[PDB]
Design a protein around this motif. Structure first.
Motif, PDB file in Angstrom:
ATOM      1  N   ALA A  42       0.825  -1.202   0.000  1.00 19.80           N
ATOM      2  CA  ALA A  42       0.000   0.000   0.000  1.00 19.80           C
ATOM      3  C   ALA A  42       0.863   1.257   0.000  1.00 19.80           C
ATOM      4  O   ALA A  42       2.065   1.197   0.255  1.00 19.80           O
ATOM      5  N   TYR A  43       0.240   2.395  -0.287  1.00 13.63           N
ATOM      6  CA  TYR A  43       0.953   3.667  -0.324  1.00 13.63           C
ATOM      7  C   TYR A  43       0.152   4.759   0.379  1.00 13.63           C
ATOM      8  O   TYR A  43      -1.034   4.947   0.109  1.00 13.63           O
ATOM      9  N   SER A  44       0.810   5.479   1.282  1.00 14.78           N
ATOM     10  CA  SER A  44       0.161   6.552   2.027  1.00 14.78           C
ATOM     11  C   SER A  44       0.852   7.887   1.769  1.00 14.78           C
ATOM     12  O   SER A  44       2.077   7.987   1.831  1.00 14.78           O
ATOM     13  N   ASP A  45       0.056   8.911   1.480  1.00 15.89           N
ATOM     14  CA  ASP A  45       0.589  10.242   1.214  1.00 15.89           C
ATOM     15  C   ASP A  45       1.167  10.860   2.484  1.00 15.89           C
ATOM     16  O   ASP A  45       1.978  11.783   2.421  1.00 15.89           O
ATOM     17  N   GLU A  46       0.743  10.344   3.633  1.00 15.21           N
ATOM     18  CA  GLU A  46       1.218  10.846   4.917  1.00 15.21           C
ATOM     19  C   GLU A  46       2.211   9.874   5.548  1.00 15.21           C
ATOM     20  O   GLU A  46       1.842   8.776   5.965  1.00 15.21           O
ATOM     21  N   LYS A  47       3.472  10.286   5.616  1.00 15.43           N
ATOM     22  CA  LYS A  47       4.520   9.455   6.196  1.00 15.43           C
ATOM     23  C   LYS A  47       4.009   8.719   7.431  1.00 15.43           C
ATOM     24  O   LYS A  47       3.494   9.337   8.365  1.00 15.43           O
ATOM     25  N   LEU A  48       4.155   7.399   7.432  1.00 11.52           N
ATOM     26  CA  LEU A  48       3.710   6.580   8.553  1.00 11.52           C
ATOM     27  C   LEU A  48       4.874   6.254   9.485  1.00 11.52           C
ATOM     28  O   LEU A  48       6.029   6.550   9.178  1.00 11.52           O
ATOM     29  N   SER A  49       4.561   5.642  10.623  1.00 12.14           N
ATOM     30  CA  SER A  49       5.579   5.277  11.600  1.00 12.14           C
ATOM     31  C   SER A  49       5.528   3.784  11.906  1.00 12.14           C
ATOM     32  O   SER A  49       4.451   3.206  12.058  1.00 12.14           O
ATOM     33  N   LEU A  50       6.700   3.164  11.995  1.00 11.35           N
ATOM     34  CA  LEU A  50       6.791   1.737  12.285  1.00 11.35           C
ATOM     35  C   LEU A  50       5.900   1.362  13.465  1.00 11.35           C
ATOM     36  O   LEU A  50       6.072   1.871  14.571  1.00 11.35           O
ATOM     37  N   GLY A  51       4.948   0.468  13.220  1.00  7.22           N
ATOM     38  CA  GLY A  51       4.046   0.038  14.273  1.00  7.22           C
ATOM     39  C   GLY A  51       2.768   0.853  14.310  1.00  7.22           C
ATOM     40  O   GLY A  51       1.944   0.689  15.211  1.00  7.22           O
ATOM     41  N   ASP A  52       2.602   1.736  13.332  1.00  8.34           N
ATOM     42  CA  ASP A  52       1.416   2.580  13.255  1.00  8.34           C
ATOM     43  C   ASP A  52       0.224   1.795  12.719  1.00  8.34           C
ATOM     44  O   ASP A  52       0.328   1.103  11.707  1.00  8.34           O
ATOM     45  N   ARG A  53      -0.909   1.907  13.404  1.00 10.39           N
ATOM     46  CA  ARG A  53      -2.122   1.206  12.998  1.00 10.39           C
ATOM     47  C   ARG A  53      -2.814   1.939  11.853  1.00 10.39           C
ATOM     48  O   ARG A  53      -3.007   3.153  11.905  1.00 10.39           O
ATOM     49  N   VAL A  54      -3.187   1.191  10.819  1.00 11.81           N
ATOM     50  CA  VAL A  54      -3.860   1.768   9.661  1.00 11.81           C
ATOM     51  C   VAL A  54      -4.957   0.843   9.145  1.00 11.81           C
ATOM     52  O   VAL A  54      -4.812  -0.379   9.163  1.00 11.81           O
ATOM     53  N   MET A  55      -6.055   1.435   8.686  1.00 12.60           N
ATOM     54  CA  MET A  55      -7.176   0.664   8.163  1.00 12.60           C
ATOM     55  C   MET A  55      -7.284   0.819   6.649  1.00 12.60           C
ATOM     56  O   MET A  55      -7.207   1.929   6.122  1.00 12.60           O
ATOM     57  N   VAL A  56      -7.463  -0.301   5.955  1.00  2.83           N
ATOM     58  CA  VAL A  56      -7.582  -0.289   4.502  1.00  2.83           C
ATOM     59  C   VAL A  56      -8.873   0.394   4.062  1.00  2.83           C
ATOM     60  O   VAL A  56      -9.970  -0.094   4.334  1.00  2.83           O
ATOM     61  N   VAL A  57      -8.734   1.526   3.379  1.00  2.00           N
ATOM     62  CA  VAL A  57      -9.889   2.275   2.900  1.00  2.00           C
ATOM     63  C   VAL A  57     -10.484   1.629   1.653  1.00  2.00           C
ATOM     64  O   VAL A  57     -11.700   1.628   1.462  1.00  2.00           O
TER      65      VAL A  57
END
Length: 74
Positions: A42-57
Motif C-alpha cells: 500500500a501507499y500513504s501520502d502521509e509518512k507513517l511510523s513503524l508500528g502505526d495502525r492503519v485501516m484499509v480504505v
C-alpha cells in the motif's frame, strides 16, 4: 453444509478492505502493511511510523490504500 472443499493457493482474499493492519515497514516506493498476517503493498501520502495502525480504505486488487487511525484510549 459444513464440509470444507477449499484447497486455497492465492493469497488474494480481497477482504483487507475495512480491516485494520499494522505497518511492519515503510518505503517511498511502497509501504509494507501486514494485514490479516500478510504484508501487502500500500501507499500513504502521509509518512507513517513503524508500528502505526492503519485501516484499509479500499483495495484495487494487489494494492490497499491505508489511512492512519487513532487509538482506542483516545
Amino acid at each position: 453444509r459444513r464440509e470444507t472443499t477449499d484447497i486455497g493457493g492465492g493469497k488474494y482474499t480481497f477482504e483487507l478492505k475495512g480491516k485494520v493492519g499494522k505497518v511492519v515497514k515503510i518505503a517511498e516506493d511502497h509501504y509494507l502493511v501486514e494485514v490479516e498476517g500478510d504484508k501487502w503493498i500500500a501507499y500513504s501520502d502521509e509518512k507513517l511510523s513503524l508500528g502505526d495502525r492503519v485501516m484499509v480504505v479500499d483495495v484495487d486488487g494487489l494494492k490497499l490504500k491505508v489511512k492512519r487511525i487513532p487509538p482506542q484510549l483516545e
